[PDB]
Amino acid sequence: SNRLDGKVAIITGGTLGIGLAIATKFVEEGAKVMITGRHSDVGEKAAKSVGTPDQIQFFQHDSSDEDGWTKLFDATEKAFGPVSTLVNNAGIAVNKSVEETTTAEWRKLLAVNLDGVFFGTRLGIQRMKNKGLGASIINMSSIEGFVGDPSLGAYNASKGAVRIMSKSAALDCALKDYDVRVNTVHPGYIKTPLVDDLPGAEEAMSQRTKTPMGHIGEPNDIAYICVYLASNESKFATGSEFVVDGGYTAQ
Amino acid sequence: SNRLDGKVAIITGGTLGIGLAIATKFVEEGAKVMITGRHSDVGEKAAKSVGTPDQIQFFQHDSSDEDGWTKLFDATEKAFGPVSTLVNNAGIAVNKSVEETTTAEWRKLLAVNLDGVFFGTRLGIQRMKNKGLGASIINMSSIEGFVGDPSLGAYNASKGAVRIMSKSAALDCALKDYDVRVNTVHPGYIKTPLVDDLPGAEEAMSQRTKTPMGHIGEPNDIAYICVYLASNESKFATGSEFVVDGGYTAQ
Amino acid sequence: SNRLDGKVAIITGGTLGIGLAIATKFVEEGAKVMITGRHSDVGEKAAKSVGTPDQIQFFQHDSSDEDGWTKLFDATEKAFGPVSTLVNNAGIAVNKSVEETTTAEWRKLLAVNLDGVFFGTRLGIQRMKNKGLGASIINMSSIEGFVGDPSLGAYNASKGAVRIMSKSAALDCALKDYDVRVNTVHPGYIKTPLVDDLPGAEEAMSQRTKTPMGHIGEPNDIAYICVYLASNESKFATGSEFVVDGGYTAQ
Amino acid sequence: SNRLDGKVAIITGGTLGIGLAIATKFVEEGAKVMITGRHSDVGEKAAKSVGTPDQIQFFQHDSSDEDGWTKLFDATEKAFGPVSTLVNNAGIAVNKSVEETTTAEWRKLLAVNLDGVFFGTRLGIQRMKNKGLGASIINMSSIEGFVGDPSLGAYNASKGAVRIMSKSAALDCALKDYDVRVNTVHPGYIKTPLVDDLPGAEEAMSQRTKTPMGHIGEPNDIAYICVYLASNESKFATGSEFVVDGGYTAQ
Numbered sequence A, B, C, D: 001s002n003r004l005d006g007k008v009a010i011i012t013g014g015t016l017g018i019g020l021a022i023a024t025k026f027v028e029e030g031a032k033v034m035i036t037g038r039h040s041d042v043g044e045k046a047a048k049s050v051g052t053p054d055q056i057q058f059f060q061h062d063s064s065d066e067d068g069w070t071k072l073f074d075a076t077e078k079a080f081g082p083v084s085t086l087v088n089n090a091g092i093a094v095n096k097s098v099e100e101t102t103t104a105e106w107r108k109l110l111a112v113n114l115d116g117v118f119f120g121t122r123l124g125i126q127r128m129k130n131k132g133l134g135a136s137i138i139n140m141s142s143i144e145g146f147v148g149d150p151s152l153g154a155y156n157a158s159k160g161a162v163r164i165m166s167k168s169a170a171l172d173c174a175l176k177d178y179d180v181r182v183n184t185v186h187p188g189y190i191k192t193p194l195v196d197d198l199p200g201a202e203e204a205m206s207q208r209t210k211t212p213m214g215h216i217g218e219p220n221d222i223a224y225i226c227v228y229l230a231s232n233e234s235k236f237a238t239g240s241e242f243v244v245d246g247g248y249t250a251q
């Protein structure tokens, strides 16, 4: 209760799964939220499922769309006032090794997972700095930003990039007294409707050689660390990686 | 409010500084707390300053005292019921390089910072496992568990040890379905009365080449990440390192 | 002497600085080498300065040029036989924070430092696998793949990407018994003619708060770790990061 | 050939396995070597198997024996002249979780793996500094200094300690211009006669979920990285971790 009072958050890919849970908990803690997603059908439903338009709205946007980022920030401020909090959560995966990744696949994934995060972080710093907002940028950077996976080559590239680019941004903001923190969150495997739609995926993810807890997480596991990072409770945390993975990376 | 309802926590070195702030926020969130420290004068005052004996008590103990750990767990359970949460926060520092560390200094520091954490973690697992408590062991492992400092040789050894020993414990608990999580917290420099008593220390800690934010933290910065880790909000986090350092390790 | 007997290496950006030193030591250890660079004037001079055409040749290529990679591998094999070793060393830097990076700057840097490394790694795996060559791909991934720098935002992104993408590739090659290893090398600051051309740069790099050794490295420092990684001496090393930085990242 | 000309090395636990291979390659590269071990029977045989007494000798010593360290350095200097190189390789393992580790087991393992490395590093700095030797201390710090293992609790503690204590020492030596480098080497699983004596161990170590290469290493894999680190080739490497693990930590 009240942990995000006054905050105004953008959550990319906020209409499903992890992003939707982050949105839900943000609203519960007093934030106003603009969620984005590619599909209006899904997105309007999602916003209404969380709260009323005075609490949460949807904005249709592909995070790779540089011009759309400007429109997104403007729409959010029009609805809720100046943005304090950005969660760069939108992302896609290609299930290919580096060897077998086509250049089109490479470019498509990087456009969302790397360029999109860059566009959001860059614009967020510019729009959120020097306003006394306790501003916070939270970049979703995966266990695949720490360890490789033989069949996630491009995804690994994107997540390693987000991990270290976020430190750069954190440092510049800190050094310049911008009142903007930047941190990364690194989920392990999380149960969502999309995982449920892939037969055997959860079971394979839950083997002890993968996730030592013997089961996978759930979207609220990621929501709660994001509440901490968005809140003023984490005012001394910047440039750091927050891993919530069931032990995946500990072995 | 209510984030630690029902929890029963031991916080070593809980009478001062970081430990005291962790205790204060734990009580505010509904936990019952036993704080430890070496000095009864300080410790009884500290407990009363936070709350009444039904909320928080003091137990005099040096964390290097193996036999005392058993007495501490027994006293805490007698007061509050079964322990769910342990914060291994007690620690000391020697301001010597490896080269200049005497063997007595080495042994003294390791007894508190390494043996003490081992004793607490080992006993905590045994006493807290398999009780449906949502048990959590939080080990204080420092930015000096990630980077070296030329004048903190023994301290660095102890903090690196705690960092990786905690992963071992996390994994065993996960694999055995013990319902015990183990994580480490890594503060950067934090302002306390002890720092205030060392002329020039805060200023040197606050130079941008040390802490990019240009100032040091405060005890509640560490309290809030500990609330998260003690709570069931972090039920999928185990074997991980949580850094709150003002950017120190990001550069 | 003889540590790279029989090896055939491509070194991108091999006409200057670090790349040139890697080429020089590779030839001294018995490898045949194709160096690349953008400028024929510089590149032909460089090759001849190291050895004769039976030892080392130049191929003009921008590592962002996907089609040129195919031509480079074909030219190298025509000259020297099947390629065993690839050093993805070509890279550029933009001296901008994330906030101040233009999209053109972002795309330009990623094209060389990320796409180029992807193109080389992908093609290298395909061309070098399953030939009994003891093949090795060495990706230059910087101290800026571990820590952020407030004025190297895009560079940090690229180096973090290379760091983790290389692990993916390493794992797939290992799991598939391809006889290809992939590792990253992370130089700290190294003295080159280009550094000498920036007044004050070496001095600033040599301050103890930057490089604890109080001076910067020299190109052969990076050459020697690359000899190790190219050689069969390192046949059990894959997916790892090799840092040669004067202590930069240790504090 | 000649890569360690003039060097004088102490290798603890040099009579078997990894240590013996390091000794063998050191002698081949021109170093004079004193190997240590607990058992004279084994140690004298081992030294003679590598070379003549003008190249390599044995000194009986338990690395936990603080007073014996002084005698070891004196004996080595008497035989070969001033010591330039120390490899802290002696170590033991206890196959217990943190939960199940007895205090006696804890103390025994730490005495060898942590105190012994401290004693050697401390004395090495004192004896090797400021002599123009290109001195190098190489501390064996394991993949178990990066990741936990549920049944290696005390071992993990010791290896994490060595990892970060070595950075402290590296930094102090660098900052004080001591001409001493300190680095850590982190083997994955390596085939030795002792591994061969444990039925099924190699096979379990070689499963892809453990070592992605599908086989384990051999002692010379660790010898060759130690040659690099002992040599002047690595004069800009200090405070760093060198992992040779078949991909174990990359996933």
Ligand SMILES: NC(=O)c1ccc[n+]([C@@H]2O[C@H](COP(=O)([O-])OP(=O)(O)OC[C@H]3O[C@@H](n4cnc5c(N)ncnc54)[C@H](OP(=O)(O)O)[C@@H]3O)[C@@H](O)[C@H]2O)c1
Pocket (backbone or CB within 6 Å): A012, A013, A014, A015, A016, A017, A018, A019, A020, A036, A037, A038, A039, A042, A061, A062, A063, A064, A089, A090, A091, A092, A093, A112, A140, A142, A143, A187, A188, A189, A190, A191, A192, A194, A195
């Ligand atoms: N859940 C897991 O099993 C798991 C495990 C490891 C890492 N992760 C990472 O964690 C992040 C969040 O996961 P999730 O569960 O929310 O994802 P999800 O349930 O798998 O659904 C995919 C998400 O990606 C977003 N997205 C993809 N392309 C987009 C685009 N062009 N523009 C805007 N949004 C786009 C979608 O946003 P919209 O629905 O709003 O259109 C959607 O929410 C992901 O980026 C993923 O890489 C997830």
Ligand SMILES: NC(=O)c1ccc[n+]([C@@H]2O[C@H](COP(=O)([O-])OP(=O)(O)OC[C@H]3O[C@@H](n4cnc5c(N)ncnc54)[C@H](OP(=O)(O)O)[C@@H]3O)[C@@H](O)[C@H]2O)c1
Pocket (backbone or CB within 6 Å): B012, B013, B014, B015, B016, B017, B018, B019, B020, B036, B037, B038, B039, B042, B061, B062, B063, B064, B089, B090, B091, B092, B093, B112, B140, B142, B143, B187, B188, B189, B190, B191, B192, B194, B195
């Ligand atoms: N605050 C900082 O500037 C800073 C920076 C980096 C890391 N840290 C680490 O964070 C941890 C918490 O810091 P802090 O601010 O609470 O410490 P502090 O204000 O500096 O005071 C020292 C603390 O160490 C505890 N302690 C030392 N020996 C003990 C023993 N034998 N038995 C029980 N307790 C013992 C004391 O416990 P009692 O008072 O209860 O007797 C006391 O709370 C420390 O372990 C420290 O290593 C602190």
Ligand SMILES: NC(=O)c1ccc[n+]([C@@H]2O[C@H](COP(=O)([O-])OP(=O)(O)OC[C@H]3O[C@@H](n4cnc5c(N)ncnc54)[C@H](OP(=O)(O)O)[C@@H]3O)[C@@H](O)[C@H]2O)c1
Pocket (backbone or CB within 6 Å): C012, C013, C014, C015, C016, C017, C018, C019, C020, C036, C037, C038, C039, C042, C061, C062, C063, C064, C089, C090, C091, C092, C093, C112, C140, C142, C143, C187, C188, C189, C190, C191, C192, C194, C195
């Ligand atoms: N030296 C340092 O101070 C330092 C410090 C940290 C990291 N690094 C990294 O280490 C790597 C090697 O450094 P260095 O000293 O060799 O570089 P350098 O002396 O600074 O010269 C720049 C190099 O980048 C290469 N390059 C840039 N764009 C290229 C392109 N489009 N196609 C082919 N080559 C291109 C050039 O190759 P050609 O000359 O052949 O055209 C040239 O060798 C660099 O990638 C750099 O990011 C260097």
Ligand SMILES: NC(=O)c1ccc[n+]([C@@H]2O[C@H](COP(=O)([O-])OP(=O)(O)OC[C@H]3O[C@@H](n4cnc5c(N)ncnc54)[C@H](OP(=O)(O)O)[C@@H]3O)[C@@H](O)[C@H]2O)c1
Pocket (backbone or CB within 6 Å): D012, D013, D014, D015, D016, D017, D018, D019, D020, D036, D037, D038, D039, D042, D061, D062, D063, D064, D089, D090, D091, D092, D093, D112, D140, D142, D143, D187, D188, D189, D190, D191, D192, D194, D195
């Ligand atoms: N080989 C592996 O499967 C493996 C895997 C991961 C990590 N490691 C680590 O790598 C290091 C080297 O392995 P290794 O193969 O040489 O060991 P090993 O073949 O398993 O034999 C044990 C070694 O430990 C040394 N040792 C134990 N206690 C000692 C003491 N009190 N004083 C002096 N030496 C002592 C012995 O030295 P002496 O024989 O001279 O008496 C012996 O060489 C070890 O410390 C180990 O922790 C090994």
Ligand SMILES: CC(=O)c1ccccc1
Pocket (backbone or CB within 6 Å): A093, A095, A144, A155
């Ligand atoms: C971990 C991850 O990003 C992923 C993506 C698609 C399918 C399975 C896993």
Ligand SMILES: CC(=O)c1ccccc1
Pocket (backbone or CB within 6 Å): B093, B095, B144, B155
């Ligand atoms: C960082 C730390 O532990 C310390 C301890 C004593 C004095 C100054 C710093």
Ligand SMILES: CC(=O)c1ccccc1
Pocket (backbone or CB within 6 Å): C093, C095, C144, C155
């Ligand atoms: C470290 C690095 O890449 C760099 C590049 C250009 C100028 C100064 C440093």
Ligand SMILES: CC(=O)c1ccccc1
Pocket (backbone or CB within 6 Å): D093, D095, D144, D155
């Ligand atoms: C990895 C390691 O140290 C070990 C020790 C004893 C038995 C098996 C493994």
Ligand SMILES: [Mg+2]
Pocket (backbone or CB within 6 Å): A147, A248, A249, A250, A251, D147, D248, D249, D250, D251
């Ligand atoms: Mg792993």
Ligand SMILES: [Mg+2]
Pocket (backbone or CB within 6 Å): B147, B248, B249, B250, B251, C147, C248, C249, C250, C251
């Ligand atoms: Mg640093």
